Amino acid sequence: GRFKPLAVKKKYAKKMNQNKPVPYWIRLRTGNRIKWNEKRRHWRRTKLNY
Amino acid sequence: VSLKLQARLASSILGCGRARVWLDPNEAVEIQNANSRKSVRKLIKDGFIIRKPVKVHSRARWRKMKEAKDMGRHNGVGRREGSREARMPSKELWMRRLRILRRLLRKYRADKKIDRHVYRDLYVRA
Amino acid sequence: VAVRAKVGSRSYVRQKQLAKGKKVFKIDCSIPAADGIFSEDVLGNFEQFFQDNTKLNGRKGKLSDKVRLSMNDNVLTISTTMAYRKKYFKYLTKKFLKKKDLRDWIRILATGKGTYQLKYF
Amino acid sequence: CPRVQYRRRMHYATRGNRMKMVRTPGNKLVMQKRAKRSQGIHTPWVLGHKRLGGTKALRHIDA
Amino acid sequence: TFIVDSRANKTEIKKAMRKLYQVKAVKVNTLIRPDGLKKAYIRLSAAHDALDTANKIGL
Amino acid sequence: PREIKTLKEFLAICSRKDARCVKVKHNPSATKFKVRCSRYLYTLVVNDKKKADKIERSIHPSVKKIAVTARSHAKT
RNA sequence: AGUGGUAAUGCGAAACACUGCCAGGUAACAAAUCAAUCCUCCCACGGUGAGCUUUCUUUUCACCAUAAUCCACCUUGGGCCUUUUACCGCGUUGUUCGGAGCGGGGGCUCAAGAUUGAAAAAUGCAGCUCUACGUACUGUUGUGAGUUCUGCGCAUUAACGCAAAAACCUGGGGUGU
RNA sequence: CCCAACUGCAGACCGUACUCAUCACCGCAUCAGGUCCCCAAGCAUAGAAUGCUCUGGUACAUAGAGAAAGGUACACUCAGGGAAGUCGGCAAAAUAGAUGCGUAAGUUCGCAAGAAGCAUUGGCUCUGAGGGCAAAAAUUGCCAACUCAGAACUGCUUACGGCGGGGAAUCCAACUGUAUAAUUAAAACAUAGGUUUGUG
RNA sequence: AGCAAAGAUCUAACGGAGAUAUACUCAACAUGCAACGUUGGAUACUGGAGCGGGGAAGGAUUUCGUGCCAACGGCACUCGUACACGAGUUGUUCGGAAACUGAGCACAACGUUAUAUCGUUUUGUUAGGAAAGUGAAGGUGGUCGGCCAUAACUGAAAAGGGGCAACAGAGAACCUGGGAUUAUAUUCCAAAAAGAAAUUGCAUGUGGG
RNA sequence: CGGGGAAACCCAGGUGGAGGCCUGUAGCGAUGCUGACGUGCAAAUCGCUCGUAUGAUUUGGGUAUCGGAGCGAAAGACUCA
Ligand SMILES: NC[C@@H]1O[C@H](O[C@H]2[C@@H](O)[C@H](O[C@@H]3[C@@H](O)[C@H](N)C[C@H](N)[C@H]3O[C@H]3O[C@H](CO)[C@@H](O)[C@H](O)[C@H]3N)O[C@@H]2CO)[C@H](N)[C@@H](O)[C@@H]1O
Ligand SMILES: [Mg+2]
Ligand SMILES: [Mg+2]
Ligand SMILES: [Mg+2]
Ligand SMILES: [Mg+2]
Ligand SMILES: [Mg+2]
Ligand SMILES: [Mg+2]
Ligand SMILES: [Mg+2]
Ligand SMILES: [Mg+2]
Ligand SMILES: [Mg+2]
């Protein structure tokens, strides 16, 4: 809805900026470990509940 | 191919509804590069998008039926489906009558046809 | 509404004559006549079609001294003292104009407060 | 036959809300809000809670 | 339009649009975005051109 | 918005420092002199078409006169 | 140092200016009945466009808009004043009222509207006409039905009696003296 | 120094997208479950019943081809008989709106009662009543919106939807109400009424 | 086994790799079927207790444009609430807070407890309980025509400490028009603000005591 | 308002709109089919029928009462399947 506290809005804003994939040049480093992001949250599969 | 963005913007510029906008099926090329409300307003002005008129809902079959019912043609006993005191409430028939009687008695007393002793006798009997 | 109607009284109805008089409805037939289509065989029936089918007090084809037509230069001019509608002679033109298959060539179109104009598309 | 929405973030038919249903110059029904009214200036409750004469019913800033 | 810091008010954004940029803000309309950042729409005083300021900034 | 009664009060309002513009609206019956001051919009309704043009000539020097027309959508 | 009207109570460009203390009112609440506002629906008038036409249909459908905010002030429901005193009368659809002042005659007020205007045509919509989201013109009833806004409360069935406070308003008393 | 009408300047913070559900929430899921509020058109009709329609929305829920048996249905009929079926009229049938008449025993006199049981109902063309506001005004003018009764004439294949079957007794609880979410809604529980006890 | 409630789809033209897909001596049917999106047209449905238009709780980018089809949308997909990329939420007046009280809560104080993580704490109201830091009137001495107003001593009068708890109660100053969006608007619109207002704080000037 | 009566009082026609009244939507329940489903749409649902629907009525948000305890028109029912 419309009401949220700003401290809940700023937690919901962090998770939008974390919901981005691994870039391709990460996959080209020397001691690489990361193929995919393992933390890709989708709004329907798993709920944050802030 | 997909004229879905120009069909959504046309319903909100013409203000009508999607079953009532008419996009020209021939000029699917000139419509699909609209991309703005300014461009769809040029297509509405050019005759490539229009508002169609609404579908008809005619009262002519009711109006002819009312002219029968004003002469009392479809109001008999088999056609009456609800109660007597719902079609005409007997409180409404009493209120309408008693207001006619009291307005007449104020009319004849103000015209001084009757006396205030005659008024008060005929008021409580009404 | 005050007195009940009768079914037999639907022959004659009340047209409600004007108090002052002379409400005049011109119909300009200049574009379909001079530019071909309407000859002086149909334009002589266009002045006839209103004298034959305009209703007056419910009855058809019996107007006498209440509707007058008189046919000006290219204009059919309906002068009347009975309360007709301007929207009635747009209707009564389209019946004539449908009867001769001319209602895909000609628009009747409002120009002034008391005149029409048959024009092409 | 035109159907209207609330316009002022509150959507409950309380005595404070009481909307007014008006037609605009752009030919649309909107939903405007009726002001609450005052009962008016009164005589004390212990003297018969009666409305004074010559005094107007003015609510909060119109008073 | 600027991203500003999210803990400024509209009064101190106008005063920063005077000291940095030699223009006069008549109206600021701030907006904390779903990104988390505060965005301000800053209308100039019609004695100052918006493109002439935006070329000097360069954008 | 308010309304001016006489002409002695119209010329006092057009002498004011806040009066940005007088808007002149020619109705088919009357004319309207709509002085836009800083709080209210004052309107003088002159019903006579000949006395209206005489009133326009008395607000010549340094107040802004505007002929109100129907601005189309294309000016935007 | 406010001031008119026997009186109900009136008069606001800037003194009819201020509030230690006090007392009221507002906020502040309530059925059903009847009357019902904005608005909706219908009908009636017409204008513009559209739809139908072998026949019929003075025809069917769409549209016909007016926001806040001011300003000036005809109704129909409350309260009251003054004058005549009346004890049968006035009044409601309805369970009632009157020498503790009915009814008439004149009034003062309050509440809900109506009306003229400023806004506001410059806007809106639908048409259409002319050499490009272009222009010039043309149009802007109802003793019908439904409406809880209101009338409306010391106001409901009741061994049911229907929140509070901030904020504000007026007075008393004082100052101005 | 007080005040009026005006003017001059400034008017800070947070929310604001989208959803609110036969896909956006909860049930593990885009689950026939659940989930508070506002606006609410036409015709039939007593009508927020029910049936259909302009506005808005939709054609999305795996489809195609297609006479098995057997199923399941918010699907029907069935001659003669008419509960003989069965633990049991379970299931279906039947009754049905409205108006006029009529109605028993019992009774706490309030009811029982829509008791029971009879009759009428269309379409059409008319005739009567039931009113307003504008000038023996006990009468001349004009006009809206409906409702009921009567009358000829004419037709029925008894023909949408919606809508009690009824009666005679016995048991139990007075009544409306509550009540084992997910096998028991009862005669249980509550109830008013009655009594008792403790207490200054 | 099944993918059987919520009636239902048909047509042509385009789009698309998804066709009209053939070793001979074959005219076509009998050897490329099925399925997708968009617009037009036809046919229906929902039927205003709506597969309408907005809100709370809940969700938190699902919004919007553009690409795109690996996996997901139990059939299908060229579609998507999927995926990638880029955007998108504008307020003096709207909702909240600043700033109300209610059912209640329990900080301070006091008591208790081996232990505060316990109790009391609205029946007008804390605490064996000196919780008022505000200030009438006057005195002191720079200001305005015996009244004000502005600065520092003395002292009438006010018992009963703080803070929460209502986005449906109280309170609350803005309304239309817009050609202003791809997406926001009673929020954006700048000199003819499309405009018309209301309100708060502070200030000049004019005028009045 | 009318009628009867010497009186006590009776008799009739309206008015009025009372009720934990009745039929019946929504809402709130859940009687019967011992219907459908029973590796379901569903760890309790679907369908028709049924109870009630101005009241001891339904409901949102807020608050207050819990583990040998809470609350209970009482079924050992309910206290996050
Ligand atoms: N004060 C006025 C009086 O009214 C009287 O009028 C009264 C009588 O004419 C007549 O009285 C009747 C009467 O018919 C008969 N003899 C006796 C009967 N009881 C009365 O009946 C009266 O009382 C009964 C109550 O019982 C009421 O129901 C009813 O309203 C009324 N009619 O009805 C009238 C009352 O309404 C006489 N004119 C006279 O005594 C006198 O003028
Ligand atoms: Mg009422
Ligand atoms: Mg579901
Ligand atoms: Mg038999
Ligand atoms: Mg199947
Ligand atoms: Mg239908
Ligand atoms: Mg799939
Ligand atoms: Mg994504
Ligand atoms: Mg019942
Ligand atoms: Mg037991």
Describe the structure.
The structure is cut from a larger assembly and holds chains A (50 residues), B (126 residues), C (121 residues), D (63 residues), E (59 residues) and F (76 residues). Chain A has 50 residues and is mainly alpha-helical. Helices cover 24% and strands 0% of the residues of chain A. The longest helix of chain A is centred in the first third of the chain and has 12 residues. Chain D is low in regular secondary structure and 63 residues long. Chain D has a two-stranded antiparallel ribbon. In chain D, strand 1 and strand 2 form a beta hairpin. The radius of gyration of chain D is 17 Å and the shape is elongated. Chain F is built from two helices and four strands. Chains in contact: A-E, B-C. The interface between A and E is small, with 8 and 5 residues. Bound molecules: paromomycin (PAR) and magnesium ion (9 copies). The structure holds four RNA strands. Chain E: GO terms for molecular function: rRNA binding; structural constituent of ribosome. Chain E: This is 60S ribosomal protein L23a, putative. Chain E: Belongs to the universal ribosomal protein uL23 family. Chain E: It comes from Leishmania donovani.
Summary, kept brief:
The structure is cut from a larger assembly and holds chains A (50 residues), B (126 residues), C (121 residues), D (63 residues), E (59 residues) and F (76 residues). Chain D is mostly loops. Helices cover 0% and strands 6% of the residues of chain D.
